[PDB]
Amino acid sequence: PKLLYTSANFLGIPTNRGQPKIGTYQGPELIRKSNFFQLVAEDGIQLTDCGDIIPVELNEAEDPQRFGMKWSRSFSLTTLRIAERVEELMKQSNKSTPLVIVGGDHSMATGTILGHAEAKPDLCVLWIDAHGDINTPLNSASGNMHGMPLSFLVKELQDQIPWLDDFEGIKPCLNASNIAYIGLRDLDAHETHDIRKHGIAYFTMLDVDRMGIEAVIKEALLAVNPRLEKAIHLSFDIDALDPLVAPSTGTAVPGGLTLREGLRICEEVSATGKLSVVELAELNPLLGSQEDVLKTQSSAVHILRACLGHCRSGHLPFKVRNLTDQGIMSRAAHMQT
Amino acid sequence: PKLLYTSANFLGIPTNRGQPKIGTYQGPELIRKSNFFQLVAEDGIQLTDCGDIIPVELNEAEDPQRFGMKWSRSFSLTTLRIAERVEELMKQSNKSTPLVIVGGDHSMATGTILGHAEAKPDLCVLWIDAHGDINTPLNSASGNMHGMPLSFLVKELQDQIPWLDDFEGIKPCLNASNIAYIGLRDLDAHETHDIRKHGIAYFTMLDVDRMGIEAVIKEALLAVNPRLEKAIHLSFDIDALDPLVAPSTGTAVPGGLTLREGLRICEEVSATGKLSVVELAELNPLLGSQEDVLKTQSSAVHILRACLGHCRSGHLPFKVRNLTDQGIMSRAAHMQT
Amino acid sequence: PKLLYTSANFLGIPTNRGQPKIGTYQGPELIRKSNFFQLVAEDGIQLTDCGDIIPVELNEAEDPQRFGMKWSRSFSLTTLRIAERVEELMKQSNKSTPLVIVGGDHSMATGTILGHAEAKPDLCVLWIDAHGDINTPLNSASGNMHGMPLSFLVKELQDQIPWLDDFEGIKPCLNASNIAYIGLRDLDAHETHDIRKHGIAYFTMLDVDRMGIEAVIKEALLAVNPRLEKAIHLSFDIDALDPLVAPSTGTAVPGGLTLREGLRICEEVSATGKLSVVELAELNPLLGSQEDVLKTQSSAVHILRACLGHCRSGHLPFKVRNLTDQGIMSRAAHMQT
Numbered sequence A, B, C: 001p002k003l004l005y006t007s008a009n010f011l012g013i014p015t016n017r018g019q020p021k022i023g024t025y026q027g028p029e030l031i032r033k034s035n036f037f038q039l040v041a042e043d044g045i046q047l048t049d050c051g052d053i054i055p056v057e058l059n060e061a062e063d064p065q066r067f068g069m070k071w072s073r074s075f076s077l078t079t080l081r082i083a084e085r086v087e088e089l090m091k092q093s094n095k096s097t098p099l100v101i102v103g104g105d106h107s108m109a110t111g112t113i114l115g116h117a118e119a120k121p122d123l124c125v126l127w128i129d130a131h132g133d134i135n136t137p138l139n140s141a142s143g144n145m146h147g148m149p150l151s152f153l154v155k156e157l158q159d160q161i162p163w164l165d166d167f168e169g170i171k172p173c174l175n176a177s178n179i180a181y182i183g184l185r186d187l188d189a190h191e192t193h194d195i196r197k198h199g200i201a202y203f204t205m206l207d208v209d210r211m212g213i214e215a216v217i218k219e220a221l222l223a224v225n226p227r228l229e230k231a232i233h234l235s236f237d238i239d240a241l242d243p244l245v246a247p248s249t250g251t252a253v254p255g256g257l258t259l260r261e262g263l264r265i266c267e268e269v270s271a272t273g274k275l276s277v278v279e280l281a282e283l284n285p286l287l288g289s290q291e292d293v294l295k296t297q298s299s300a301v302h303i304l305r306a307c308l309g310h311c312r313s314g315h316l317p318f319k320v321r322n323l324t325d326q327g328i329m330s331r332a333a334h335m336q337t
């Protein structure tokens, strides 16, 4: 057998202040509960559990609304804390060692990318999501941070981000030409404006319907990593998949990716040999029935396994078992006498 | 932003005598209950609620079976009543103003098309359905009117329709060359005979599998509206979609259209700028679980929004919010000092 | 109308010793309970019920584990019993008469193919499954016979099958070049080794994603029956279909075939005019909710109907009903006076 990645790191980030629905903090445990670790090992990969990042959760009286944003100071404090740990993990392993991150709501992405970009500043980002998550604070109708994580990272958008002192440590590390969306089907108007204005590459479900997922992946990589020179940060919101496949998530949107389409994305990104960080966001075991949570867990595991290099086409055994070395009479041997 | 249709009309038709399962009369309310109106408004479209048509529901003793048909006199009386109102609405708005109609079982289609054809006699019809709904009375095994609505409209079939005095006002206004089916997977034998005999264009799920939905739509329009000269009556039976997507309907048939395929049909028809009337039939909130009804409602809303011109690719904002006119210090401005 | 097959045989095999989960013995009854027979008749086909094969179910004390295998002696005794009956049925009908077989777990396949190959030795096999079912006894982690049925049949694998006296009657009748897989997504490593080593044709879900089901079917037939000269044994594991479509099965694996893709396989194989035996395995009415069992039953019926030649494009009536021979006044006739 052969493997692009022979070892990987696992990191849990139970962020739950990016959106009002409680349960995303149970995200990392939902994956740890599963047979994910067992399965990755059987594929011949050494997965090291790097524990969980403790997010900063201020008391409501310590964190009033600022510019409509909810839990903004918790966000800024958590962001920096994420960035510090991710940077350490990335520099420590600097045939690479991918970081698998499990959220947690998507607001964590500001921290992960920032820390990732501090170790590999030339990275590109593949954002798999039903939503843009690129609302700027004054344009956000909800005030939820999981809908704004990209806006603090994109240089071309900094004249639309309100200055806040606790936000100074969060320096924009992304050019608009380094991001590519796949799976969009619920963009806010101002997101659509910014995405088109600054030429951010995006492939919606409409594009997936007209082009096919195979062409979309090829075009997404062509746009942000044309010669596979750049490290890849793969940000995978679980709600990019259709709700029939992953119902246990906060903002489900019908008409999403099939599990197979999602797997194709991960398999292709994995095969570049350039997967640096994969993050899975918006898992919420407190939403839906037990069967719903089981379905969502199952989809998450298959997706993450795909990122680490698992092939549906099969894997060769690390040692071939021969029947005669075990001194056992085979049927072929019996009739030969 | 730009819009093909800037205003539209909403009309409810709670027909429930076209089929034995009670609940389709709650169809229009299921859509009114939803956020459909709110969402259409946010897309920049003025939706006017034109109320509901009161269908004629005779007492069983007033409406005995005739030629196997159930509730035939209720059908004829209701048909004419539908036709009168639809004609008024169409002539009143004669950049068009589309009519959105929500049923109600599919027997209403005889009335809507008749009234529509009275204002726009050169119309073509796109029938999205698992079934032909073109059984002639003596060939119908069930005797349900929702399985015969097209047969009273097609000129080439009038030698197969039993003469009834109360049916005189229902004059065939459709040539067989004006109809195109998409989504068929449960045709009765005599429907298959008539469809092939008179050269009615039809694309079954088999065709969708072998050609892809994109080619099917193009071929369907090519067959009945080759140069986008004709107004389009879009008759959308909800059971055309797969039961996994829309379970709350009377005659569900496995192996149907995905939500995405259905959306593609509506998006393309909408983009012709020729959508005159869109009708959605066979919603039944009294079938299946609450989650089933929620799923069916959700699918209906996304479909109808697609007809009115909603793009999954995003919509531009009607006014761009600038951070400096609001007199707020942006991060870009702060560092520039 | 026209029909490739005008008559067919139905045979139930309630095998339940190939896997630990009880309920697959209720498989044949689940199909008999359905409207399958009624529907096949309406398509104009004479289905003869050939009853059920009574599988051999030894007492645990009579059937200890041998080489890790569970219920191996029950397997060998049952296999021979299956083979004897299938051979009789095949020679008896030797425009062919297809055998429709309903399991029962997939361990029955050793018996059916053996008996089938005894009447038509030049047959090819189309294996539709999430799994290879080609584990050799010493390589099997589970020791379940439903995971090994193919290994006893493939000549190239006989040096990997442990000699057992009760297994002598089971002679390998298949060359590796006569088998083609469709739908694989959960191969064991040693299966992957054997499949690639001996050049067995296989198309995984990855292949289905990149090629499309239409190309996969064409390539599968090209590999094992290039000129439609060989009779076809179609072995269809229900878990080849996605769990959303067929949840009531023992080893469900996400990311499977849609119902439409499965139907395409059956429709194409049927259209060769070379369908000799179709078997449906792994139905288990004791797994999942009532709605789950209903969904699984429904999928099974549509699949089997497709094998017998049912077209979603419609069937012509065996006698056209004219309105005037019945002495009834048509609307066309009324206005003509």
Ligand SMILES: N[C@@H](CSCC[B-](O)(O)O)C(=O)O
Binding pocket: A105, A106, A107, A129, A130, A131, A132, A133, A135, A140, A141, A142, A143, A144, A146, A147, A148, A188, A237, A239, A250, A251, A282
């Ligand atoms: N426009 C919405 C987008 S929410 C999407 C959140 B997510 O992608 O993380 O699930 C908002 O600003 O809250």
Ligand SMILES: N[C@@H](CSCC[B-](O)(O)O)C(=O)O
Binding pocket: B105, B106, B107, B129, B130, B131, B132, B133, B135, B140, B141, B142, B143, B144, B146, B147, B148, B188, B237, B239, B250, B251, B282
């Ligand atoms: N052959 C059936 C067709 S029923 C289809 C009804 B509908 O398309 O409206 O759900 C019949 O005549 O009742």
Ligand SMILES: N[C@@H](CSCC[B-](O)(O)O)C(=O)O
Binding pocket: C105, C106, C107, C129, C130, C131, C132, C133, C135, C140, C141, C142, C143, C144, C146, C147, C148, C188, C237, C239, C250, C251, C282
């Ligand atoms: N590797 C597994 C495969 S089980 C597949 C069983 B079946 O295809 O019949 O559902 C085993 O040896 O038990």
Ligand SMILES: [Mn+2]
Binding pocket: A129, A130, A131, A237, A239, A240, A251, A282
């Ligand atoms: Mn999202």
Ligand SMILES: [Mn+2]
Binding pocket: A106, A129, A131, A133, A146, A237, A281, A282
């Ligand atoms: Mn997100």
Ligand SMILES: [Mn+2]
Binding pocket: B129, B130, B131, B237, B239, B240, B251, B282
């Ligand atoms: Mn229908």
Ligand SMILES: [Mn+2]
Binding pocket: B106, B129, B131, B133, B146, B237, B281, B282
């Ligand atoms: Mn209909």
Ligand SMILES: [Mn+2]
Binding pocket: C129, C130, C131, C237, C239, C240, C251, C282
């Ligand atoms: Mn299987």
Ligand SMILES: [Mn+2]
Binding pocket: C106, C129, C131, C133, C146, C237, C281, C282
């Ligand atoms: Mn199997």
